[PDB]
Design a protein around this ligand. Structure first.
Ligand SMILES: Nc1ncnc2c1ncn2[C@@H]1O[C@H](COP(=O)(O)OP(=O)(O)NP(=O)(O)O)[C@@H](O)[C@H]1O
Ligand SMILES: CC(C)C[C@H](NC(=O)[C@@H](O)[C@@H](O)[C@@H](N)CC(N)=O)[C@@H]1Cc2cccc(O)c2C(=O)O1
Ligand SMILES: [Mg+2]
Ligand SMILES: [Mg+2]
Length: 335
């Protein structure tokens, strides 16, 4: 959780106020997680249960959130299974509860996706191919998506707050900042067109979808933005390498297993030219840098535990040394 948001948030106060806008009893709310947003499951007066996501104007505007809502609705209209937004009692997509310190807590609600998180029995090539087909369909569909009013436009990849490392890491980390600057300049040389770049989810991982009768239902579109399609794919790879459901015996071999199955599914649904596969290591490194920023945004750097200092030191060393995120040779996937 963004440290500045944590400094503003009084859960009991906000849930008491939120209870009137969504018709729940605040003592009955179930806390789910507090990673980027504070997320709860609540039950309304009719006995129906929903997912409540709470954040703050420090990190999101209502307008920006409405751009996520627009896109999710478009995907659902075109047959992509996603968790849809639900309205407040006043018919609003996003409710704002004043923060007396300035700004607002921003609240919105979604339908609870059926099914469940993937388990060990699902963690295999069938899932990996299904992820490929689903991602490919999202990309194929997004090619036709138009924003009428630029006020609600989602960000370009390079605008991401957590990549602004110079604002979050101490400035004596000049090597890290050089690595990040060099990499973003490199990525900026890549061709952009409707066939290779568009609005994507940008945080695909197995905490962000349910498997329902063997089908994917995605949620947590909170980071969606304009990216290369290969980056959406690389982010998913980053995430399955980081927290696999079953530990892998070998990182390189697992990378190839995941990617081969994923690509079979993906290419049934959308074109991905072989030339993009060579860029995956660079996008994995960019994600590593983003996570480094996220961790600095979350941690009080004056009160770091031994474990937090060690984690930061590992990322730092990997970034400085240019240690590949995976040892897999991506040229093996080509032709
Ligand atoms: N629509 C939904 N249906 C069912 N469960 C959900 C839904 N949205 C969120 N959850 C659950 O709540 C958790 C947290 O919500 P999520 O939207 O992932 O929050 P976040 O703070 O953006 N997390 P992240 O960005 O992945 O670190 C998810 O991992 C799910 O377990
Ligand atoms: C605390 C945080 C570091 C946790 C991390 N989440 C992410 O890396 C991403 O959600 C963020 O990097 C992303 N929200 C940042 C962004 N700007 O898009 C992790 C990533 C992850 C990978 C695989 C399975 C999972 O369930 C998860 C998960 O739930 O969260
Ligand atoms: Mg999530
Ligand atoms: Mg999220």
């Amino acid at each position: 959780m963004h440290k500045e948001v944590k400094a503003r948030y009084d859960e009991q106060m906000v849930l008491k106020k939120a209870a009137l806008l969504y018709h729940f009893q605040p003592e009955q709310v179930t806390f789910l997680a507090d990673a980027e947003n504070y997320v709860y499951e609540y039950t309304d007066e009719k006995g129906s249960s929903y997912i409540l996501k709470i954040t703050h104007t420090i990190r999101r505007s209502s307008t920006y959130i409405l751009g996520e809502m627009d896109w999710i609705r478009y995907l659902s209209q075109h047959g992509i299974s996603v968790a849809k937004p639900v309205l407040s009692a006043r018919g609003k997509d996003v409710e704002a509860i004043p923060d007396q310190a300035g700004g607002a807590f921003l609240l919105r609600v979604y339908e609870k996706a059926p099914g469940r998180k993937v388990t060990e029995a699902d963690w295999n090539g069938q899932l990996f191919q299904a992820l490929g087909a689903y991602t490919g369909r999202m990309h194929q569909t997004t090619k036709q998506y138009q924003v009428k009013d630029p006020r609600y436009k989602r960000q370009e990849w390079y605008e991401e707050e957590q990549l602004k490392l110079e604002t979050y890491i101490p400035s004596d980390q000049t090597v890290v900042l050089q690595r990040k600057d060099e990499l973003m300049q490199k990525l900026h040389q890549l061709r952009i067109s409707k066939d290779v770049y568009g609005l994507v989810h940008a945080d695909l991982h197995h905490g962000n979808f349910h498997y329902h009768q063997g089908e994917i239902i995605a949620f947590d579109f909170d980071d969606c933005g304009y990216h290369w399609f290969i980056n959406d794919i690389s982010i998913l790879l980053y995430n399955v390498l980081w927290y696999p459901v079953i530990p892998y015996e070998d990182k390189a071999e697992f990378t190839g297993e995941f990617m081969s199955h994923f690509l079979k599914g993906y290419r049934q649904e959308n074109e991905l030219d072989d030339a993009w596969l060579a860029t995956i290591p660079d996008f994995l490194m960019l994600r590593h840098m983003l996570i480094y920023g996220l961790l600095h945004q979350a941690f009080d750097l004056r009160t770091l535990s031994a474990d937090e200092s060690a984690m930061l030191a590992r990322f730092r060393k990997e970034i400085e040394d240019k240690t590949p995120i995976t040892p897999f040779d991506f040229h093996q996937l080509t032709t």
